[PDB]
Each structure stands twice: as structure tokens, then as C-alpha cells.
Amino acid sequence: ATKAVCVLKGDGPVQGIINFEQKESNGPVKVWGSIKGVTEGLHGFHVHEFGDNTAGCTSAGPHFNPLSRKHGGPKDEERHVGDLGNVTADKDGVADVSIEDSVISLSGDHCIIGRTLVVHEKADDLGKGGNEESTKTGNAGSRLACGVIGIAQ
Amino acid sequence: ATKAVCVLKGDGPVQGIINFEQKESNGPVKVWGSIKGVTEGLHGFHVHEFGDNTAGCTSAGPHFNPLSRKHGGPKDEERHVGDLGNVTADKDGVADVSIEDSVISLSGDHCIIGRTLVVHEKADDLGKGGNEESTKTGNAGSRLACGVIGIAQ
């Protein structure tokens, strides 16, 4: 298997460890881990284009979108490659993450290694919201924590 | 023209930003930036195998060494891919880095994107120190600061 890891850090503290595993390069990626320090409810969760955290999470740029599509949920055909939907945290501020995704990859042109994983202030409307912003960012608001996705042993 | 960046941080006061640029696939990579908060003198400077920072810089594992070579200096034929020698800090504790390397790459099987850059406590003896640890780690000692190498705009 190919494996990757991301350490998310932001003010709070928001702290997370997210694991990625892809048994075959034509197969889906299992994404799992825990994020603590966030508000109860949904928080947008995406892979962003650049693995640049020089000025913080803002340096990561837009959602990873190699196919030039509009924003969506992980279930939509019309989505960015980076669109991983929402993580949901409880009252204790903890979001337990267990995702399987068929569109991200840990090799080839959809590869997310060396790009930034970001957890957001607010819910991602999965592009089903009211406005145009829904179709770009899903109205998920500010970036609470991020880290660069690295190759793991 | 491929670009990458790394933000170095540790448990102490050691901070850096290092930029990478490769104009041509299989051309040389220009490595530049600044590191502050280190002692005056030489500090080992290497790409390590994993971009895993779960338990800090220790999680990065050994020097990146896909060709199974012994440790050396960047000017040696016998070197690890990750062997970038030393950065030298002044009395202000600041190390200005300007390197060109043709062994590292930002694409292909020598690719460093998603791996960890590490700045060390002590000098790298470039494998010529004449103990056995010269030929593995170069005796550069603890890891002062590190970060995952990310894709830049």
C-alpha cells in the first residue's frame, strides 16, 4: 500500500492527525483520524492546491482542482478533486474522521501528496447552497487548521 | 518550472523557510532561504524519507535513500539522495541558504515533494569523520527543526 499522513495545526489549539491508505493506485483512498478543538457541528474538509504554509493556511490557495470543475460534495460527479465534504465534531470538540474516497489518489495526476489538507470554520454546503460561492468554496468560511500531506511509512 | 517550499519548525526557537525551484525535469534544483535561531557553525541539512511529523521530526525516519547508498556530502558520488550537506550560521544565529543540487528532484523517482527537510544540532561530517555513524547520519545529531516539503505556486 501507499500511505500518507497529515498533522493539522491551528489556533485553539486545533490539532489533528489524518491518515491516508491506498492499496492500489487504481483504488480508493481510506482517510481516517481525529481532529480536536473545533466547535460542535460540521466543518468543511478539503485538499487545497499548494503545500505552502509560509503565511499560514491562506498560502495553500484554492481547493485542489486539476480538472477545472465546480465545487461539490464527495458524492457528486461535479466536484473538485479536493472535495472531501465535512467532518462533524461533537460537544467535546472532537471530529472522528472515517472517509473512503475514489477521486483523490496518492499517485498519478490526482495525487494529493505535498498539498495542504484544511479544516474550515463552517459547514461545506456541498455546492447545494444558495449562491455562487457555494460552487467555489461551499461557504465553509475561514481556515481553522491545516498541514501538508506527507508520504508515510 | 516546478516549485516547492518548506516551513521549518521545532520544539525550540529554530525557524526557517526554504524554497525549491527546478526549471527542467531532470535539471538542477535551486534551494534557497533562511534559518534563524541556531548556534553559530555548521548544521546538517537533509531530506528525510517520510513526510510524517506525527510525533515531531523523529517521525521523518532516516535520510531519503532510494538508491541504497551510504551517507556522504552533496558533492560526492556516494551519497544519499537527501544529502544536502550543511548550512552555516553566523553569530546572529542565522543561516542563509543558497544551494544548487542535481541529485534531488521535484519530479520522478528522486522526488522530494512530501518528504521532510531537517536541520540538525551539529555539523554533518559529509561521511569523512571516520566512525561508522559518519557513513549513515554523518554525526549531525538531534533534529532541531523540520517541515514537510510542499508543492508551491
Ligand SMILES: COc1ccc(C)cc1N
Ligand atoms: C476510512 O476507514 C478506515 C480505514 C483504516 C483504518 C485503520 C481506520 C479507518 N477508519
Ligand SMILES: COc1ccc(C)cc1N
Ligand atoms: C533563486 O535564488 C535566490 C533568490 C533570492 C535569494 C534571497 C537567494 C537566492 N539564492
Ligand SMILES: [Cu+2]
Ligand atoms: Cu478547504
Ligand SMILES: [Cu+2]
Ligand atoms: Cu537529517
Ligand SMILES: [Zn+2]
Ligand atoms: Zn471544492
Ligand SMILES: [Zn+2]
Ligand atoms: Zn545521508
